[PDB]
Design a protein around this ligand. Structure first.
Ligand SMILES: C[C@@H]1CN(c2ccc(NCc3ccc(CN4C[C@H](O)[C@@H](O)[C@H](O)[C@H]4CO)cc3)c([N+](=O)[O-])c2)C[C@H](C)O1
Length: 765
């Protein structure tokens, strides 16, 4: 039955607008295949369009906002885009129609509306760009009756091993098409939809904007050659109308010009399915998808007081839709340094200078290709897989569609090397690379990242103990199926656990350090003088200088998180030898936390180092780091240490701000210093962990029940209101929140773990 559910899942998920790096575009979950993309831009002059055209996502003064109003990757969704610069409000509706053997059919309506500021008679160029990769695949534009282009629908007929036979239609659509009285119309027509069919080497098909501009440039060149000049020039919008040249090729550019508002439809008809998809089909399925989304949202995300209000509901559906709507499929080579230089061992004082020199040998090389299906932090800034980010992303998604979450987990785990490493940032393919400066591309196999995907597995396990609707929860409704998934995955989790122990180990035995166990101690590789990028908390203060004797409490706590999970799952698979080993490790980490990381003087957990005189020193910077054993659920609900931590959490003069917990205490000497990335701001992911854990204490008999309840109540409210106030005033979810003013700061469109706010509002952990 497992293989059955798997086949149906493949078929359900194959098609999507899985190109979140651009405003609107589709591709299937197949590395080399058919992809589409939307471009648009006002044209007012002879030079302006190169500046106005839109394709890849950004955020600047010219763009008010954009995002998904509803989305499910199984059904589709609606996207809004508010473009100030081009004076346009765009809707993109995408929907999926199951049937056939090839992942079904889809359709999209593109609707544009001039806003109040735009000239009523603005000319807008719209382009739909289609490419196909494959050695055996074909795609052809059916030519038009008319002389110079199309009065009606453009039909592309194609075939591939992947997709079977298919037909992609770009409808005539509604809207005023400008007509030119110029002489040039004798040769190029007065104005109409036009198509160019081109062929380039597969590996450059993705560069739609440059491909396009080279054609525009060739049209203009042709004008100048044929004596169209400034003595009497054609209208701008006609200079940038391509000559019609439909045919076969691996690239097809469809171009329309509108005056005022417009709409058109894109219809993809899988031949192996029923009759072809119609515009009538599109509207019906859109209505249907919205109804289904409505119904699911209110079961899964039942917002509890005081967020029962309709304004909170809209906020929730926006945050949730943007998170899940950011799901991408990515395909290509990664850049990895596979030298395993000895300098990366960081066993020396000054190790950071050694490792810089090893990196300057530039031994890195492309490898793969790999594929990844994942959600992302940020469409405009970070449209790619980040390992510990995904652990947070998949918590709300799991609620919505557990089967979808497990697919993404599976996708991540299939990237793991034989050693147990997964690169923390997955930049797959040249397209992906185009958004990342060269300095930041290379991944290193000694760099770790918090194992947050373990949290999502933890939720899966609890749910397991305790057609699209059927498929979304198939893996928990069918315990046979759930266990098979775990059986297959379990080895990989174990591998990763061992990888952590081998590569991220700290040094107990080489110093004057007594502790309960001689095994358990951890040090993040990769730190520089001011940074520990691999821990996830970029610039959180750490022992100065970095030192091979350092021990990091956050890292050890992450290991704790992993062992607990391995016990849960290994129990369920009857891996008895395995569970007993885990149990010794849990026991040891519990003691070692206290023996090496607990500070009695300061009353919290701390990182450690080694003295100028070779002795173990605690280094305390009160902040998120300090509470890690708590945030990870390793402290017994009755512990005196827990109490001391709750004092810190609640203390206004330390971590507690009106707007959530500060990353670092106001009392710390490094508060609001340097880049201030994690040296004061409020971050929703860590606040989420605090909230979930406080609620855990509040719902059990114990000494801290009442205290925890008070803190849970206020923190939940403070975080939700902060994210919401900002969302109201700005339209955006932000990366982090200022603890003095409550304003969102750093990057916009962070959906992104900011979206956990949906889970916070709905409660019942
Ligand atoms: C669109 C493109 C953006 N570019 C660009 C890309 C990358 C980087 N640094 C790498 C980087 C990557 C991710 C984050 C976010 N965030 C940080 C949290 O701290 C982590 O915990 C969390 O893992 C993580 C993910 O959310 C922060 C920094 C920089 N840069 O630093 O100058 C610039 C420049 C070009 C011009 O434009």
């Amino acid at each position: 039955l497992h293989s059955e559910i798997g086949r149906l899942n493949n078929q359900s998920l194959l098609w999507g607008p899985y190109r979140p790096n651009i405003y609107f575009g589709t591709r299937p979950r197949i590395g080399k295949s058919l992809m589409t993309g939307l471009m648009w831009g006002k044209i007012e002059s002879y030079t302006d369009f190169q500046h106005t055209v839109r394709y890849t996502c950004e955020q600047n003064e010219g763009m008010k906002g954009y995002g998904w109003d509803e989305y499910d990757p199984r059904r589709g969704g609606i996207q809004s885009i508010h473009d100030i610069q081009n004076g346009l409000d765009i809707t993109t509706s995408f929907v999926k129609i199951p049937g056939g053997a090839h992942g079904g059919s889809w359709a999209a309506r593109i609707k544009g509306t001039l806003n109040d500021d735009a000239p009523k008679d603005q000319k807008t160029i719209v382009v739909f760009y289609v490419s196909q990769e494959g050695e055996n695949s074909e795609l052809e534009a059916v030519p038009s009756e008319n002389e110079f282009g199309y009065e009606g629908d453009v039909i592309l007929k194609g075939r591939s091993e992947a997709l079977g036979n298919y037909k992609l239609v770009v409808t005539k659509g509604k809207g005023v098409i400008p007509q030119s009285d110029h002489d040039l119309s004798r040769l190029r027509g007065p104005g109409q939809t036009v198509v160019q069919s081109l062929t380039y080497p597969d590996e450059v098909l993705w560069q739609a904007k440059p491909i396009l501009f080279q054609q525009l440039k060739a049209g203009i060149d042709w004008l100048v050659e044929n004596k169209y000049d400034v003595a009497d020039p054609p209208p701008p919008w006609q200079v940038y109308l391509l000559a019609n040249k439909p045919g076969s090729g691996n690239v097809h550019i469809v171009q329309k010009v509108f005056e005022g508002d417009f709409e058109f439809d894109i219809l993809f008809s899988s031949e192996s399915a029923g009759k072809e998809v119609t515009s009538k089909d599109l509207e019906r399925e859109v209505k249907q998808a919205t109804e289904v989304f409505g119904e699911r949202f209110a079961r899964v995300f039942d917002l509890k007081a005081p967020f029962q209000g309709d304004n909170y509901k809209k906020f929730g559906k926006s945050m949730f839709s943007n998170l899940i709507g950011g799901i991408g499929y990515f395909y290509g080579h990664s850049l990895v340094d596979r030298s395993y230089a000895p300098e990366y061992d960081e066993e020396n004082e000054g190790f950071w200078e050694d490792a810089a020199e090893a990196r300057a040998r530039h031994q890195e090389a492309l490898e793969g290709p790999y594929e990844l299906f994942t959600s992302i932090p940020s469409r405009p800034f970070f449209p790619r897989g980040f390992l510990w980010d995904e652990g947070f992303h998949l918590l709300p998604i799991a609620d919505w569609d557990i089967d979808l979450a497990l697919e993404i987990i599976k996708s991540w785990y299939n990237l793991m090397d034989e050693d147990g490493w997964i690169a923390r940032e997955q930049i797959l393919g040249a397209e992906a690379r185009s958004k990342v400066p060269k300095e930041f591309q290379t991944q290193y196999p000694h760099y770790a990242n918090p194992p947050t995907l373990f949290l999502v597995l933890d939720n899966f396990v609890e749910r397991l103990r305790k057609l699209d609707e059927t498929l979304s929860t198939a893996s928990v409704d069918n315990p046979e199926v759930g266990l098979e998934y775990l059986r297959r995955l379990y080895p990989l989790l174990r591998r990763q656990f061992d990888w952590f122990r081998k590569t991220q180990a700290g040094d107990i035995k080489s110093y004057d350090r007594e502790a309960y166990s001689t095994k358990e101690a951890y040090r993040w590789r990769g730190r520089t003088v001011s940074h520990c990028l691999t821990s996830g908390l970029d610039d959180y203060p750490r022992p100065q200088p970095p030192h091979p004797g350092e021990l990091h409490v956050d890292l050890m706590s992450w290991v704790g998180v992993m062992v607990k999970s391995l016990i849960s799952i290994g129990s369920l698979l009857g891996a008895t030898e395995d569970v007993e080993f885990y149990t010794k490790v849990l026991d040891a980490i519990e003691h070692n936390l206290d023996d090496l990381h607990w500070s009695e003087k300061e009353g919290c957990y701390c990182d450690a180092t080694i003295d100028e005189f070779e002795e173990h020193k605690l280094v305390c910077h009160k902040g998120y780091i300090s509470l890690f054993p708590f945030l990870t659920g390793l402290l017994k609900p009755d512990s005196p240490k827990l109490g001391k931590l709750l004092a810190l959490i609640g203390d206004e003069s330390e971590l507690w701000s009106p707007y959530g917990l500060r990353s670092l205490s106001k009392k710390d000497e490094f508060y609001g210093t340097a880049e201030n990335y994690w040296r004061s701001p409020v971050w929703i992911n860590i606040n989420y962990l605090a909230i979930v854990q406080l609620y855990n204490i509040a719902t059990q008999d114990g000494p801290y029940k009442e205290t925890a309840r008070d803190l849970y109540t206020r923190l939940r409210k403070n975080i939700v209101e902060t994210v919401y106030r900002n969302w109201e005033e700005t339209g955006f979810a932000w990366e982090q929140y200022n603890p003095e003013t409550g304003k969102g700061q750093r990057t916009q469109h962070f959906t992104g773990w900011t979206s956990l706010v949906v889970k916070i509002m709905s409660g019942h952990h």
